[PDB]
Amino acid sequence: SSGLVPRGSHMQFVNKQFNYKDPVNGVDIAYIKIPQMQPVKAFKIHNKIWVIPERDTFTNPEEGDLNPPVPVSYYDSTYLSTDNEKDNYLKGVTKLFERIYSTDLGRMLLTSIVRGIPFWGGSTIDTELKVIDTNCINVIQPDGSYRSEELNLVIIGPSADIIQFECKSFGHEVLNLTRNGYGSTQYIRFSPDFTFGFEESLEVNPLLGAGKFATDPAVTLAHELIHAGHRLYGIAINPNRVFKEVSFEELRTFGGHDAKFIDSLQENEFRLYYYNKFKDIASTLNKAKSIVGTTASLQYMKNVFKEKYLLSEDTSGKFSVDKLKFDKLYKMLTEIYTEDNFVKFFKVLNRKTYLNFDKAVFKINIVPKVNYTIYDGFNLRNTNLAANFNGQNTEINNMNFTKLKNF
Numbered sequence: 440s441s442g443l444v445p446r447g448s449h450m451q452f453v454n455k456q457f458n459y460k461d462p463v464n465g466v467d468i469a470y471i472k473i474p475q476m477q478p479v480k481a482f483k484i485h486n487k488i489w490v491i492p493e494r495d496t497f498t499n500p501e502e503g504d505l506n507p508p509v510p511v512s513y514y515d516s517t518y519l520s521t522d523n524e525k526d527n528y529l530k531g532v533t534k535l536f537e538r539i540y541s542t543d544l545g546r547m548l549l550t551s552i553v554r555g556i557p558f559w560g561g562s563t564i565d566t567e568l569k570v571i572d573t574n575c576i577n578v579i580q581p582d583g584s585y586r587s588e589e590l591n592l593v594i595i596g597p598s599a600d601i602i603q604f605e606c607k608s609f610g611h612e613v614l615n616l617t618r619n620g621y622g623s624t625q626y627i628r629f630s631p632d633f634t635f636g637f638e639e640s641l642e643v644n645p646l647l648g649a650g651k652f653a654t655d656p657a658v659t660l661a662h663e664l665i666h667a668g669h670r671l672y673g674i675a676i677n678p679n680r681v682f683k684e685v686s687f688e689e690l691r692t693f694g695g696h697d698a699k700f701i702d703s704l705q706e707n708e709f710r711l712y713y714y715n716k717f718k719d720i721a722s723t724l725n726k727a728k729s730i731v732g733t734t735a736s737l738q739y740m741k742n743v744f745k746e747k748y749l750l751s752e753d754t755s756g757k758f759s760v761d762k763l764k765f766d767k768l769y770k771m772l773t774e775i776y777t778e779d780n781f782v783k784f785f786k787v788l789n790r791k792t793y794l795n796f797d798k799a800v801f802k803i804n805i806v807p808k809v810n811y812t813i814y815d816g817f818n819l820r821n822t823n824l825a826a827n828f829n830g831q832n833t834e835i836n837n838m839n840f841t842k843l844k845n846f
């Protein structure tokens with residue numbers, strides 16, 4: 440009915456087939472607090488990844504309420520307020536993770552994310568390794584006690600503007616965590632319950648003209664996951680680098696020909712910048728003499744980050760950045776993991792450049808297997824929807840797309 444396991448016995452990435460009503464257990468279903476908020480029920484879908492089926496009234500203090508206050512936006516303060524909606528959200532996100540993970544490209548990306556633990560750069564003491572507190576959540580147990588847990592990624596519902604999907608994180612007072620190689624826990628505001636439109640002209644009747652298509656939400660989620668990859672490895676491009684408007688970071692993440700507008704000399708400058716930031720992490724690890732807030736050894740934690748950053752270790756135990764391994768990791772994160780490449784793997788229709796979307800917004804439901812599948816998305820095989828991206832055509836597959844207003 441949901442079609443969460445098209446092949447084999449169990450889901451390959453997501454650890455459990457959760458229902459929103461499943462009781463808290465303190466392990467993979469728990470009330471959590473993000474470090475004034477009321478605890479929120481959350482689900483651990485994989486090592487280092489949690490899903491919070493709530494509207495994001497938490498991560499930004501100046502975004503506390505859901506009422507309407509630039510090209511396309513959509514508001515509904517009631518969306519994701521009921522347990523049934525939260526259940527369907529959780530199943531939708533689950534399904535999209537499995538769809539992404541069904542591709543070679545998605546397995547690579549999600550693996551990189553899970554391995555991309557934010558750096559222990561939180562000490563004021565130059566020789567001490569320490570966690571940064573905003574890279575953790577507090578996980579409340581059924582008896583009310585709690586423990587701090589490090590994590591890499593949180594998927595949460597949108598804030599006021601429902602179609603404003605983004606990858607955000609908590610800043611540091613002095614450190615630029617998304618741009619100094621350290622990385623930080625990433626919060627993706629995302630809904631699987633809506634999508635947006637784009638126009639495309641397909642060739643053949645001659646009288647066809649342009650069709651009105653819907654973006655596949657697996658592509659949208661993969662896009663935000665790619666930002667998360669850049670930001671977890673602390674190699675995001677400064678958002679003040681823009682064409683005008685579209686940021687270099689957006690063009691890089693969209694990939695394809697869009698990314699070719701970032702000139703090679705600029706690319707080289709960034710790569711060298713981040714190579715140097717990774718060498719600074721290697722020397723920080725080499726200079727480390729003590730560790731706080733864990734029963735894990737210093738040796739053990741040093742190794743966790745050797746593993747993240749693909750560092751070389753000599754017989755003396757000294758770390759260093761290997762230029763070939765750096766280039767491999769950097770190219771993977773920036774050139775290989777792109778929206779364009781996911782489109783190619785999914786074999787779906789997508790807009791051909793970052794800015795070429797419609798102001799059109801649609802309500803969708805991808806949870807039913809009759810609507811959307813892990814292998815085909817909307818373009819269900821052995822039906823009329825398999826040809827000419829008819830599943831994504833909002834006039835042909837009208838039952839799957841309800842057109843919204845238009846704020």
Ligand SMILES: O=C(/C=C/c1ccc(Cl)cc1)NO
Nearest residue numbers: 511602603604605606635796
């Ligand atoms: O780039 C984005 C979001 C892009 C986007 C959202 C909504 C619509 Cl309608 C178009 C593009 N997040 O990282």
Ligand SMILES: [Zn+2]
Nearest residue numbers: 662666689692
């Ligand atoms: Zn983006």
